[PDB]
Paper text:
Second, a sample was prepared in exactly the same manner, but was incubated on ice and contained equimolar amounts of FXN and reduced FDX2 (hence abbreviated (NIAUXF)2). Cysteine was added (‘turnover’ conditions), and the sample was quickly vitrified, resulting in an incubation time of less than 1 min at ≤ 4 °C. This condition allows persulfidation of ISCU2 but only slow [2Fe-2S] cluster synthesis. Additional weak density at this site, typically associated with conformational and/or compositional heterogeneity in cryo-EM, was further assessed by C2 symmetry expansion and focused 3D classification. This revealed two major FDX2 conformations that we refer to as ‘proximal’ and ‘distal’ according to the distances between the [2Fe-2S] cluster of FDX2 and the FeS cluster assembly site of ISCU2, namely 23 Å for the distal conformation and 14 Å for the proximal conformation. In the distal conformation, the [2Fe-2S] cluster of FDX2 is too far for efficient electron transfer to the ISCU2 FeS cluster assembly site (23 Å), whereas the movement to the proximal binding position brings the [2Fe-2S] cluster to a distance of 14 Å that would allow rapid electron transfer for reduction of the Cys138ISCU2 persulfide. When bound in the proximal position, the C terminus of FDX2 is ordered and well resolved, interacting extensively with the NFS1 subunit. Contact is mediated by hydrogen bonds (H-bonds) between Asn175FDX2 and Cys-loop Ser385NFS1, a salt bridge between Asp179FDX2 and Arg393NFS1 and hydrophobic interactions of Phe176FDX2 and Val178FDX2 with Leu160NFS1. When FDX2 is bound in the distal conformation, Cys69ISCU2 is shifted away from the ISCU2 FeS cluster assembly site, whereas it is facing towards the iron, but too far for coordination (3.9 Å) when FDX2 is bound in the proximal conformation.
The process is initiated by the mitochondrial core ISC complex, which synthesizes a [2Fe-2S] cluster de novo from cysteine-derived sulfur and ferrous iron (Fe2+). This complex is composed of the iron-sulfur scaffold protein ISCU2, the dimeric pyridoxal phosphate (PLP)-dependent cysteine desulfurase subcomplex NFS1-ISD11-ACP1, the allosteric regulator frataxin (FXN), and the electron donor ferredoxin-2 (FDX2), which is itself reduced by the NADPH-dependent ferredoxin reductase (FDXR). The sulfane sulfur (S0) of the persulfide on ISCU2 is reduced to sulfide (S2-) by FDX2 to initiate [2Fe-2S] cluster formation.
Residue numbers in the entry:
A (entry chain D), G (entry chain H): 35 to 157
B (entry chain A): 56 to 455
C (entry chain B), H (entry chain F): 5 to 85
D (entry chain I): 69 to 186
E (entry chain C), I (entry chain G): 3 to 76
F (entry chain E): 56 to 447
Write the structure that this text describes.
C-alpha cells in the first residue's frame, strides 16, 4: 500500500454523521458500480455559503476510505462552486492510486457532487 | 517485526524435515536422473523412485501410477485436457462444478473453445453438489467428471466416494483435485474409485514448483501428453525431472502420512476455538459453508457491514485472505461465494483464515482479539451498519 | 533405558529451543513433548528401541535445521515482542 | 458527425448502433444494452472490454499502446484483430465498424452470470 | 527474592495454583509431575536463573528446597 | 570414492552462490508471490521481479519480456505450439533444423499431427545449416523458424544473427533454443533479431525445475497459452511461480554475466589441452562437428573400432555420455550424428566430453590418461581393428 | 551394470584369435541388426569331435562382450551337438540381461551357430 | 589498505580451503587467487573499496556454504586418493 | 629433516627450480614473489608443519632462514 493511503486509512479525518434533516446539510450516498464500495458524505454550509463541516462514512476498501477522508478534508473550508471543481483525477493523483483503484476516486467525486446537489435541492 | 501467517491455503512453509531431505541433492547429488551411464544418474534415479514410492504409499496407490509434474495446475491441465483429447473420437462432454479451482475452470473453458461440451454443476447452499443432479447430467458421451475433494476457499468436502461409485457405475472417468486434501484427510484411490488425482507440493509443506498426478493403471486410463519431448515420465510428462523437488515432495508425503492424525486433532481444536471466540464476541458473523462436511483448517467468515480488504488492511499484523472484489487484479467477485448463494454485500465481507501444522494457540488468540477490535471500529465507521441500525434496510443507494 | 530416554528427551528439547524461527521452535517443542508423553506406557523393548532410534534421527535433523536457520535468520514475529 | 457501428453479441445477434464522433465503444455498448463487462470502466486494469474488430476497419484504428497490449495479454481467446473496447474512440472512418463480443472474459462466470451494467 | 521466583517457576511448570509448593514438597509424590515434567522444570529453572545445572545436581533436584538451595548456592 | 563428473551438458552442479541466494526463501520467505494483501506475498513478488530483472539484464532484454517456466522443455513447447496455434488462421508452415533438441522436434511432430506443415532443414558436414537453403525454404505462409544457438550433442554454433536478419527481412518469427548458450557465449536479443528464446536453469549452474522464455514485446509477439489457470506470468503461463527457484535462476544469470569471460578462457584452454592430448596419443580419432564454429565446452569424439558404451563401462570412474544406440532405452541411434553425415560405425563410437566452470586440469589429465589406456585395450580386443590391421 | 556382466567385461575369457586356415577351426563373424555390435568367435575341435579351445573378439557394448566371453567358456569342453543346444535364453538368464539387451545374447547364439556351421562346412 | 587486503585475502583462502567438495574447493581457491592477481594495479580508492566490499560479501557466502557442505558431506572423489 | 622440507615447499610455491632456495635468499628481492605469493607460502608452511603462525611471526617470516628458524623453534 502507499504511505498516503495508509495514513488516511489509519488516521481517518472527520468520521461521523450530521443531521440530514437540517436546512443547511447536504447528504450524498453513493455506491460503486463494479464493486460493493459505498460512501456516505455530508456537508454543512453556513449563511455565507462556505462549507464549515464535512464528515463521511464509508463501507469499502482502504483506498475508498482514504478517498472519502481526503474528499472531506478538501471541501472543508471551500464554497459550493469551488467544491464543484474537485476532480477524481486530483484525488487519484494526490493518493497515487493504481489504475485498479480509480473507482475509489470516482466514488469520492460522485459523493461530493451528490451532497452538493442535495444541499442545492433543499435550498 | 513480521506478521503472523494464517494463509496456509495459498501456500505452506517448508517443513524442516523436507528441507533436510532436499539439501543433499542440492549440494552433492546433482546428477541427471535420466543419465543411464553413470553413478550420478543412477543415484538420482534411485532417489526419484524412492520419492515416487513415498507418494504412492501416501495416496494408497501403486508407484507406477504416479507421474511427477510441476504443480497441481499442470496436473489438472494434464488430467482434463489429456483425457478429453484422447477420448475425443467418441466422448465430447465434460462435467465439473461451479466451485472448482481456476485451473480446472479455465481448462474446461479452453476445451469449450475446442468444440467440447462442458456442464458446470451447481452446488447447494452448503457448498456440496447434488448426486441426483450429477446423475441426471451424465450423458452417454460424457468423458470426464471433475470434482475437487476440498474447496480451497470455503473448505467444504465433497462426497468423493459416492461420486466415484456413480462414475464407475456409469463408465465415466472420475478426476478429483486433491491439492487441499492430500496429507490432511484420508485418501484411498481404490476405495474412492478415483481414476485421476492432482497433488500440489507446496500445499503439504513441500517445495514449490513440484506436483504429481495419479493415473489409474487397472483399468487403464489414457491421456494425450501436453508437453512434447524425450518421453520422460512414461511419455506423459516430457522434460528433466527435478530430483531435489521430487525428493522433497516424497519426504513431505511421508511426513504427512505420519502426522495426519495428530495434525487433524490439533487443527480441529484450534479451529473450534477460533470460531467460537469470534462468534461469541461479534454479532452478525456467518460462516460460509456447512460445518458438518467442513475441513477445519480452512475457515471462511463474513463480517457484515465491514469490507474485506479494509479489514485486511486493519489486520496488518496478520497475513490473511479475502474474497472481496477490491482484492482482485481485475475486480473479479468471488464465484465460489456466488455459487453457494451468498449475497453480494456479504461476499465482499468474507475473510479466509488458515490453520495448519505450525499454527499456535497464541497466534489464534491474537488474531481473534485483533479481529474483534478492528471489526468493531470499522462497523462504527460503516454507513451500512448505521443504515441497518436506523432501519433504512439498504433499499435506495445511488449507484451512478 | 529410562536414563537414556530422559537424556535424549532433554537433548531434544535443548536443541529445539534453539530454533531461530517461531513456528519451527514452537512446533518442535510441542511435538517432542506430545510424542514422549504418548509413548510413555510402551512395554515392548523392541518398540522402545525403534522409538529411540527414530528420536535420534529426528534430533540429528533438528540439529542440522537449527544451525541452518541460524545461518539464514530473519526478524521476529509481532507476538514475540 | 454520425458513425454507425454494429455490435455482435455472444449469441450472434447483430445490434446496429448509431454513435457519434468522439464516442467510446464501451460506454456506447453499455448505453445500447450490449453485455460488455468493462469492469474497471476504462481504467486499463481489467481487460474485460475485449472486443473483436472487423478486418475492414482494424487497420483504420490507432495502433494500440503498450499498456493496451500488456492488458490484452490477460484477455482469453485473444486474436489478431483484438482491441480493448474502452480504448476505441469513434471516428468518421469507422463507418460500418463491427465489434464482436468474445465468448468469455478474464472474470470467471461459468454459471452464466451476467454482471450488472457498469 | 530468589525463592519466590523458584516457587513461581515450579507453580507455572506444574499447574499447582501456587499454594501447595512448600519448602518440603516433592515434585513426584506431593506434587503431580513425572520424570518428563521434572526435566522441563529443571530446564525452566536454568532458563530463568541463567546457569547450566550438571546432571549430578539435576538428579539431586527433587524438591523445592533442593532447587532453592542449588539456586541460592550458584 | 565417487567418479569424476564430466557431463555438464546433461546437467550442471548447483553454484554455491545460487544456493546461498535460494536458502533464505526456502527457510523464512515462504509466501506466495501472487498473494496481494500481505507482506509475505509482497516480499516474494519483489524477489521474483528482482530475478526477472537479473535474467533480462543477462540476455540484454527488458524485464517485462521474461516469462518464468519449469524448464527449457516447457519453454520450447510454449514458443513453438503457442506461436503456431495463435497464427493458425494464416500461417501453417514451420521451419526447423534436423539436429534440434527432442523437445523442439516432438513439438513439430505433434504440430504435423495437428494439420501443420513442418520443414526439417538439413545441415552440412560441419553441422551448420545453409542460409541459402533456409531462404529457399521460407514460404509466404511460414509462421516460425526455430534454430538452436548451441547444439547439446556436438557443440556447434549456428549463425544466429544472420538467421535473425533473414527472418526479419522475410517477416517471419525467429525462435532460438539457447539452453546450451546462455551464460556461456554473448547473447543479445536486439542485435540478433531474436523473437523467442528458451532458457534452462540447471544448464547454467542454477536449480532444476525452473526455466524462462523470452517473448519480444516490440513488435508484440503473441502466443496461445498451453497451461490454463489464473493467468499469472502475463497470462502466458498459469500456476504459482516458484520463488526459490526463480531467485536461484536469477542469481545464476547474474553469476554467469559476471563470470563468462573467465569461464570461456579457462574452458577454451582446458578444451585444446584435452583435444590435443587425446589426438596426439590415439590414432584414428576424429572430432564430430566443425572447430571454427564450436563451443569448446562440448567435445564429441569418435574412437574408431571401439564401441561407445563399452568405452563408457571401461571409464567407470569418469561420468560421461555417448551417442551409441546401446545407451538408449529404445535402441535409438544418434540422429544428430546421422544428420551431420557420420558413418554408422563411427556414430556408434562417439563419446561426449563436457568441460565446465568447476572442471580442473587434474580431472582433464586423468580422463585423458584413462581414455588412452582403455581405447588401447578395447582396440586390442576389437575384431574391426584386427581386420583393418589385416588390410580388409 | 549387473555384477556378472561387470565381471565378464573386466576379466574377459579367451580374448584372441585362432588360425583360419586350420582344418579343425571354425570362424563365425556375425553382426547385430538394430545396432553396431559385431562378434567374431572361433573354436577348435579335435579328432573326437570335442571343442577344446575357443576365442572371441567383440566390437560392441559391455553386455555383448560379456555374452561373447560366456559363449566361449561355455562352448569350451563340449561337442558340436552339445554346443548346438546353447540357446540365447540360457545366456540371457545367466547374465540377467534386461529386455533392451537381448540382442547381445541373440548375437552370441548366432556367432556360436555360425562357428559350428563353418567348422562342419570345412569338414 | 594493503594490510586489510592481505588479511582479507588470507581469510578468504583459509575459508575456501575448508570446502568439503572438490569442485567447490578448487574453484574457490583458483578464483580467489586469479581475482586478486587480476586486481593488483588498481589505483582508484573508490574501485578498491568496491572490490573489498564485494570480497567481504563473497567471504560471507563462502563461510555459509562451507559449513552447510560440511553438514551435508559425501564421499571424496577418486582423484583425491 | 626439516629444512629440506622448507626449501622444497618454497620451491614448489615460487616455482624456482629447487636450486635458488638458499639460506640467505629473500622472498621478494632474490626470489620472484609478491605479497599475495608470500601469504600462500606461509599458508603452505602451516599446512605441512601443522601449526598456527600468528600475524606478527608471519610478518617476521621474510627469508628462507626466518622460516627455517620458526619451524625449528616451534
Ligand atoms: P519417568 O516418570 O521415569 O517416565 C518417563 C519415561 C518415558 C522414561 C518412562 O515412562 C519409561 O521408561 N517408559 C517406557 C517407555 C519408553 O521408554 N518410551 C519412550 C520412547 S522415546 C520416544 O517417545 C520417541 C518419540 C520420538 C520423538 C520425536 C519427535 C518429533 C520431532 C520432530 C519435529 C521437527
Ligand atoms: P602486496 O604489496 O600486498 O600486493 C598485494 C595487493 C593486491 C594488496 C597490492 O598489489 C595492491 O595494493 N594493489 C592495489 C589494488 C588492490 O588492492 N586490489 C585488491 C582488491 S580486493 C579484490 O581483488 C577483490 C576480488 C574478489 C575475490 C572474490 C572471488 C571469489 C569468488 C567466490 C567463489 C565461490
Ligand atoms: S474496461 Fe477494464 S480495460 Fe477497458
Ligand atoms: Fe474498492
Ligand atoms: Fe549392444
Amino acid at each position: 500500500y502507499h504511505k498516503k493511503v495508509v495514513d488516511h486509512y489509519e488516521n481517518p479525518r472527520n468520521v461521523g454523521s450530521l443531521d440530514k434533516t437540517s436546512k443547511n446539510v447536504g447528504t450524498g450516498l453513493v455506491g460503486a458500480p463494479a464493486c460493493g464500495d459505498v460512501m456516505k458524505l455530508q456537508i454543512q454550509v453556513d449563511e455565507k455559503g462556505k462549507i464549515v463541516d464535512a464528515r463521511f462514512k464509508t463501507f469499502g476498501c482502504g483506498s475508498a476510505i482514504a478517498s472519502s477522508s481526503l474528499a472531506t478534508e478538501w471541501v472543508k473550508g471551500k464554497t459550493v462552486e469551488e467544491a464543484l471543481t474537485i476532480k477524481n483525477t486530483d484525488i487519484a493523483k494526490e493518493l497515487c492510486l493504481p489504475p485498479v483503484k480509480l473507482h475509489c476516486s470516482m466514488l469520492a467525486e460522485d459523493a461530493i457532487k451528490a451532497a452538493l446537489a442535495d444541499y442545492k435541492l433543499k435550498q | 517485526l513480521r506478521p503472523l501467517y494464517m494463509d496456509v491455503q495459498a501456500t505452506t512453509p517448508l517443513d524442516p524435515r523436507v528441507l533436510d531431505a532436499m539439501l543433499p541433492y542440492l549440494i552433492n547429488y546433482y546428477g541427471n536422473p535420466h543419465s543411464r551411464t553413470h553413478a550420478y544418474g543412477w543415484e538420482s534415479e534411485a532417489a526419484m523412485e524412492r520419492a515416487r514410492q513415498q507418494v504412492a504409499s501416501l495416496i494408497g496407490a501403486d508407484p507406477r501410477e504416479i507421474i511427477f509434474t510441476s504443480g497441481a495446475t499442470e496436473s489438472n491441465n494434464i488430467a482434463i485436457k489429456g483425457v478429453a483429447r484422447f477420448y475425443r473420437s467418441r466422448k465430447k462432454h465434460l462435467i465439473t462444478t461451479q466451485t472448482e479451482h481456476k485451473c480446472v475452470l479455465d481448462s474446461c473453458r479452453s476445451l469449450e473453445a475446442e468444440g467440447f461440451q462442458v456442464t458446470y454443476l451447481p452446488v447447494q447452499k452448503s457448498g456440496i453438489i447434488d448426486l441426483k443432479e450429477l446423475e441426471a447430467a451424465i450423458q452417454p458421451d460424457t468423458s470426464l467428471v471433475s470434482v475437487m475433494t476440498v474447496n480451497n476457499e470455503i473448505g467444504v468436502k465433497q462426497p468423493i466416494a459416492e461420486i466415484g461409485r456413480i462414475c464407475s457405475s456409469r463408465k465415466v472417468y472420475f478426476h478429483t483435485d486433491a491439492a487441499q486434501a492430500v496429507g490432511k484427510i484420508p485418501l484411498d484411490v481404490n476405495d474412492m474409485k478415483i481414476d485421476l488425482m492432482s497433488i500440489s507440493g507446496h500445499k503439504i509443506y513441500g517445495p514449490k514448483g513440484v506436483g504429481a498426478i495419479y493415473i489409474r493403471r487397472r483399468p487403464r486410463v489414457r491421456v494425450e501428453a501436453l508437453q512434447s519431448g524425450g518421453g520422460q515420465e512414461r511419455g506423459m510428462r516430457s522434460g528433466t525431472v527435478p530430483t531435489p523437488l521430487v525428493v522433497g515432495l516424497g519426504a513431505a508425503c511421508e511426513v504427512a502420512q505420519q502426522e495426519m492424525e495428530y495434525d487433524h486433532k490439533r487443527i480441529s481444536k484450534l479451529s473450534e476455538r477460533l470460531i467460537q471466540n469470534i462468534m461469541k464476541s461479534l454479532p452478525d458473523v456467518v460462516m460460509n459453508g456447512d460445518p458438518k462436511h467442513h475441513y477445519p483448517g480452512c475457515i471462511n467468515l463474513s463480517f457484515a457491514y465491514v469490507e474485506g480488504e479494509s479489514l485486511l488492511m486493519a489486520l496488518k499484523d496478520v497475513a490473511l485472505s479475502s474474497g472481496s472484489a477490491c482484492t482482485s487484479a481485475s475486480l473479479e467477485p468471488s464465484y465460489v461465494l456466488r455459487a453457494i448463494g451468498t449475497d453480494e454485500d456479504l461476499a465482499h465481507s468474507s475473510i479466509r483464515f488458515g490453520i495448519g501444522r505450525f499454527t499456535t494457540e497464541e497466534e489464534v488468540d491474537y488474531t481473534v482479539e485483533k479481529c474483534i477490535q478492528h471489526v468493531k471500529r470499522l462497523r462504527e465507521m460503516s454507513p451500512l451498519w448505521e443504515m441497518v441500525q436506523d432501519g433504512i434496510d439498504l433499499k435506495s443507494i445511488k449507484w451512478t | 533405558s529410562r536414563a537414556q530416554v530422559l537424556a535424549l528427551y532433554r537433548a531434544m528439547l535443548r536443541e529445539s529451543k534453539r530454533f531461530s524461527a517461531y513456528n519451527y521452535r514452537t512446533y518442535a517443542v510441542r511435538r517432542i513433548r506430545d510424542a514422549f508423553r504418548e509413548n510413555k506406557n510402551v512395554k515392548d523393548p523392541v518398540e522402545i528401541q525403534t522409538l529411540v532410534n527414530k528420536a535420534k534421527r529426528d534430533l540429528g535433523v533438528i540439529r542440522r535445521q537449527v544451525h541452518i536457520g541460524q545461518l539464514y535468520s530473519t526478524d521476529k514475529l509481532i507476538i514475540e515482542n | 458527425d454520425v458513425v454507425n457501428v454494429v455490435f455482435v453479441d455472444r449469441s450472434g445477434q447483430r445490434i446496429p448502433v448509431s454513435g457519434r464522433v468522439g464516442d467510446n465503444v464501451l460506454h456506447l455498448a453499455q448505453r445500447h444494452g450490449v453485455d460488455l463487462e468493462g469492469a474497471c470502466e476504462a481504467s486499463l486494469a481489467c481487460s474485460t472490454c475485449h472486443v473483436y474488430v472487423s478486418e475492414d476497419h482494424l487497420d483504420l484504428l490507432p495502433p494500440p499502446e503498450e499498456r493496451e497490449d500488456d492488458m490484452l495479454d490477460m484477455a482469453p481467446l485473444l486474436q489478431e484483430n483484438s482491441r480493448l473496447g474502452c480504448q476505441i474512440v469513434l471516428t468518421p472512418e469507422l463507418e460500418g465498424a463491427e465489434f464482436t463480443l468474445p465468448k468469455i472474459t478474464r472474470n470467471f462466470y461459468v454459471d452464466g452470470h451476467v454482471p450488472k451494467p457498469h | 527474592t530468589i525463592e519466590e521466583r523458584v516457587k513461581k517457576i515450579i507453580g507455572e511448570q506444574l499447574g499447582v495454583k501456587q499454594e501447595e509448593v512448600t519448602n518440603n514438597a516433592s515434585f513426584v509424590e506431593d506434587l503431580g509431575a513425572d520424570s518428563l515434567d521434572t526435566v522441563e522444570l529443571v530446564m525452566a529453572l536454568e532458563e530463568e536463573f541463567d546457569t547450566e545445572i550438571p546432571d549430578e545436581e539435576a538428579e539431586k533436584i527433587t524438591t523445592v528446597q533442593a532447587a532453592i538451595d542449588y539456586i541460592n548456592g550458584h
